[PDB]
Structures are given as structure tokens and as C-alpha cells.
Amino acid sequence: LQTILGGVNKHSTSIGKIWLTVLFIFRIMILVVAAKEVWGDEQADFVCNTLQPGCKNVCYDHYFPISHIRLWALQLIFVSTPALLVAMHVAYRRHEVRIEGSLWWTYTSSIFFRVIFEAAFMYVFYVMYDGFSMQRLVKCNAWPCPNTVDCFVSRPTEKTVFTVFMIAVSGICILLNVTELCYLLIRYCSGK
């Protein structure tokens, strides 16, 4: 683990070291050591005021098609890949940190992909969960529930706090990446 952090650390620019702390210290550690157990009882303590068998199963599924923690884990995997794909290609090309030559296209594309992956996952969070605040009460009318059934979410306030934290840090990583693009564009295209 130290080698992986050190290996990525030694092959990054000035801001590329700041970006690595924001990813490991906050996105990963908070997801692992603080937020994973907040969502542990997400369906166990989902409570619906009904006597209909199977009503709770389909109402929880309707309102949480994918868990927040599963969405964040997918985002972290998608974002860490370009940062390490450029390293694996570097080892291959070297076998056969300033930016020059062919590495310029790979590094710039990797920065571009992370911005796209960041914004896409942030947009999925907003659209799917119609905001970043979790409600105490959800009203569900999917079959087999009769009419509209009241259901109550487990730990809505604590999940809102961690949702705001994850979204805000993701926005910071967006700003740090578009800034790095500006520096590369100034040095290369505006440098001419």
C-alpha cells in the first residue's frame, strides 16, 4: 500500500501531489473508516407502515436503486484508473516529473477523463436522489403496496452529512483538475 501511494506520488506534478491527498485522506478513508457502517443497516432498519408482504422490499428498491456507498466506491475506482493507467503505460514505454513528447497526450487525456468521470457521477447523484438531502419519510405506491405507504429511512441526517462531505470534496477535485488543464494549455499551446 505504501509502495502504491509512493509510486503514484513520485510521478505527479505540483498539484498532482495535492490531488492525491484529497483522494486518499478524504474520499477513501472517510468512505472506509467512517461511512461504510453508516449504511450497514440501510434496509434492515427501513420501516414501512403496512401489513402487506413484499411491500417493504419493492419500496426500498424504488427509492434506493443503488446505495450511496456503492455509488461512491464505483466513482473512486473509475477515477483512480486513469491515474494508474498512465503509470502502467509509462513503465511499458520506458522499458521499450516533467511533461514532454508522447507523454503529453497521455497525461492530458488522463486529466480530461477524470473531469468527465467526476462530473458524470456527481450528475448521477443529483438526478437519481433529487438533491443531496435525505428525507425521513418516503411515500411509496408501487405494487404490491396498497394505495400509498409511509416508509421511514434509517439515519437520514448522518447520511446527509456524509453526502455533503463527499460532494464538496468531489467538487474540489474538479477544480484542481481543470486548473491543471489551464497550466498545461498555457505552457504548451499558449507557450507557442
Ligand X SMILES: CCCCCCCCCCCCCCCCCCCC(=O)O[C@H](COC(=O)CCCCCCCCCCCCCC)COP(=O)(O)OCCN
Which residues bind to a copy of itself, rule: CB under 8 A? Answer: 2-4, 9-10, 14, 17-18, 21-22, 25-26, 29-30, 33-34, 37-38, 41, 43-45, 47-49, 53-54, 56-58, 60-61, 64-67, 70, 73-74, 77, 80-81, 84-85, 88-89, 92, 95, 136-137, 144, 150-158, 161
The answer to whether 64 and 41 have CB atoms below 8 angstroms apart is no
Q: Over the Cα atoms of the chain, what is R_g? A: 21
**40 annotated as ligand-binding:** yes
Q: Which stretches within 129-192 are classed as H helix?
A: 156-188
Of the candidate residues 59, 134, 173, 184, the single one contacting ligand X (CB under 6 A): 134
What 3 state SS string does 14-82 have? Answer: HHHHHHHHHHHHHHHHHHHHHHCCCCCCCCCCCEECCCCCCHHHHHHHHHCCCCHHHHHHHHHHHHHHH
Q: Which is nearer to a copy of itself, 76 or 122 (CB)?
A: 76
What φ, ψ does residue 120 adopt, rounded to 5°?
A: -65, -45
Asked if 26 touches ligand X (CB under 6 A), the answer is no
Asked if 70 touches ligand X (CB under 6 A), the answer is no
Strand order in the sheet with 149-152: 47-48, 149-152, 137-140
* Amino acid at the residue 189: C
**42 annotated as ligand-binding:** yes
Q: Which is nearer to ligand X, 5 or 66 (CB)?
A: 66
**What residues numbered 37-56 form the site for ligand X, per CB under 6 A?**
none
The answer to whether 19 and 173 have CB atoms below 8 angstroms apart is yes
Asked if 157 touches ligand X (CB under 6 A), the answer is yes
Asked if 167 touches ligand X (CB under 6 A), the answer is no
Asked if 128 touches ligand X (CB under 6 A), the answer is yes
Q: Show Cβ contacts of residue 119 under 8 Å, excluding neighbours closer than 6 positions.
A: 174
Provide, rounded to whole angstroms, the least separation between the CB of residue 162 and ligand X.
8
Residue range at the interface with ligand X (CB under 6 A); choices 14-22, 88-96, 157-165, 170-178: 157-165
Binding residues for Ca(2+): 37, 40, 42
